[PDB]
RNA sequence: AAUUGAAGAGUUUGAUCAUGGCUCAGAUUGAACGCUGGCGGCAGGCCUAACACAUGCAAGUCGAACGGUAACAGGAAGAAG
């Protein structure tokens, strides 16, 4: 039920005043397959110490996520940093048929056909989040009852 | 029952995030060239010189408009081997 995985891998420098250290960071998106929407970063001097913390921090900073059946209940706008993502419900459509960095975080958080397209900065670790974001933001016909109906 | 569907990647820097161009994955064509090549069905086939042309053919048809025998097909009459 954990289904964890990673969206890619990149190399940095720091350049100390002996030479070039590099360092490595992975990001990792996480979720139970309804919902619980989660992420982590994180950084080590190690490709396999790096995408542990990565999974590590992925285990807390968690939200739930509305969904209609497997779809999305509306389509809903979200923006972070520089990156624009847009997305559509389109109800048992083709499905799960998305790029690189954003692929994750919608299978995971349990949907099988909402498209994405995100416009704007394509960034791996900006284009991330503004699904958490654009997932957090949107409300649930059935629990939005409180300020709809009477 | 009927225009119900939206992907990104690479590259500036010691490394990073924006901005921003270039480049690639897709489909398509009245196509060509390179290499190769079994059959069938359907469709397509001078996109440049509106440059110029050999030869045949590409529009004739009515005797039920009319005077007519020029053809060969008979019939009729005549003259002969």
Same mark, same amino acid.
């Given at each position: 039920?954990?289904?964890?995985?990673?969206?890619?891998?990149?190399?940095?420098?720091?350049?100390?005043?002996?030479? =070039?250290?590099?360092?490595?960071?992975?990001?990792?998106?996480?979720?139970?397959?309804? #919902?619980?929407?989660?992420?982590?970063?994180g950084?080590?001097?190690?490709?396999?110490?790096?995408?542990?913390?990565?999974?590590?921090?992925?285990?807390?900073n968690?939200?739930?996520?509305?969904?209609?059946?497997?779809?999305?209940?509306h389509?809903?706008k979200?923006?972070?940093?520089?990156?624009?993502?847009?997305?559509?419900?389109?109800?048992?459509?083709?499905g799960?048929?998305?790029? #690189?960095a954003?692929?994750?975080?919608?299978?995971?958080?349990?949907?099988?056909?909402?498209? *994405?397209? *995100?416009?704007?900065?394509?960034?791996?670790?900006?284009?991330?989040?503004?699904t958490?974001?654009?997932?957090?933001?949107?409300?649930?016909?059935?629990?939005?009852?409180?300020? =709809?109906?009477?």
């Amino acid at each position: 039920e954990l289904q964890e995985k990673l969206i890619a891998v990149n190399r940095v420098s720091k350049t100390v005043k002996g030479g =070039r250290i590099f360092s490595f960071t992975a990001l990792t998106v996480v979720g139970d397959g309804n #919902g619980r929407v989660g992420f982590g970063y994180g950084k080590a001097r190690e490709v396999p110490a790096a995408i542990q913390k990565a999974m590590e921090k992925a285990r807390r900073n968690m939200i739930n996520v509305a969904l209609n059946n497997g779809t999305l209940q509306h389509p809903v706008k979200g923006v972070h940093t520089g990156s624009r993502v847009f997305m559509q419900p389109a109800s048992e459509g083709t499905g799960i048929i998305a790029g #690189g960095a954003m692929r994750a975080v919608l299978e995971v958080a349990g949907v099988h056909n909402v498209l *994405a397209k *995100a416009y704007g900065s394509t960034n791996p670790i900006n284009v991330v989040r503004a699904t958490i974001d654009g997932l957090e933001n949107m409300n649930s016909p059935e629990m939005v009852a409180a300020k =709809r109906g009477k």
